[PDB]
Swiss-Prot record:
This is Ubiquitin-related modifier 1. It comes from Saccharomyces cerevisiae (strain ATCC 204508 / S288c) (Baker's yeast). SUPFAM superfamilies: MoaD/ThiS (SSF54285). GO terms for biological process: cell budding; cellular response to oxidative stress; invasive growth in response to glucose limitation; protein urmylation; tRNA thio-modification; tRNA wobble position uridine thiolation; tRNA wobble uridine modification. There is a cross-link at residue 99 (Glycyl lysine isopeptide (Gly-Lys) (interchain with K-? in acceptor proteins)). C-terminal thiocarboxylation occurs in 2 steps, it is first acyl-adenylated (-COAMP) via the hesA/moeB/thiF part of UBA4, then thiocarboxylated (-COSH) via the rhodanese domain of UBA4. Acts as a sulfur carrier required for 2-thiolation of mcm(5)S(2)U at tRNA wobble positions of cytosolic tRNA(Lys), tRNA(Glu) and tRNA(Gln). Serves as sulfur donor in tRNA 2-thiolation reaction by being thiocarboxylated (-COSH) at its C-terminus by the MOCS3 homolog UBA4. The sulfur is then transferred to tRNA to form 2-thiolation of mcm(5)S(2)U. Prior mcm(5) tRNA modification by the elongator complex is required for 2-thiolation. Also acts as a ubiquitin-like protein (UBL) that is covalently conjugated via an isopeptide bond to lysine residues of target proteins such as AHP1. Pathway: tRNA modification; 5-methoxycarbonylmethyl-2-thiouridine-tRNA biosynthesis. Pfam families: Urm1.
Length: 99
């Protein structure tokens, strides 16, 4: 199990109950990837199905949303392939033109 913190910023928290910060328990045994986390967020934390398209496009985070792992850009860490450790913080920030 890995315990991580997710942050939804830039207005994104509107589809996650208007709550910016979330403490997520991943029951999956190591290795647990950011891909697994995203899968979990989509199937368990988006309470209106029609909102999934805001977060996801193509089994992947929708361009315009900036993803950081512990305050570093996820493209520098393997994106979905990054392996989660206890205490990690994953932040997703909606932007206008950051595609």
């Amino acid at each position: 199990m890995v315990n991580v913190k997710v942050e939804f910023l830039g207005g994104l928290d509107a589809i996650f109950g208007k709550q910016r910060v979330h403490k997520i328990k991943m029951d999956k045994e190591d290795p647990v990837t950011v891909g697994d986390l995203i899968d979990h967020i989509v199937s368990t934390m988006i309470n209106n199905p029609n909102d999934v398209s805001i977060f996801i496009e193509d089994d992947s985070i929708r361009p315009g949303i900036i993803t950081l792992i512990n305050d570093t850009d996820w493209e520098l860490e393997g994106e979905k392939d990054y392996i989660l450790e206890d205490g990690d913080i994953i932040s997703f920030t909606s932007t206008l033109h950051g595609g």
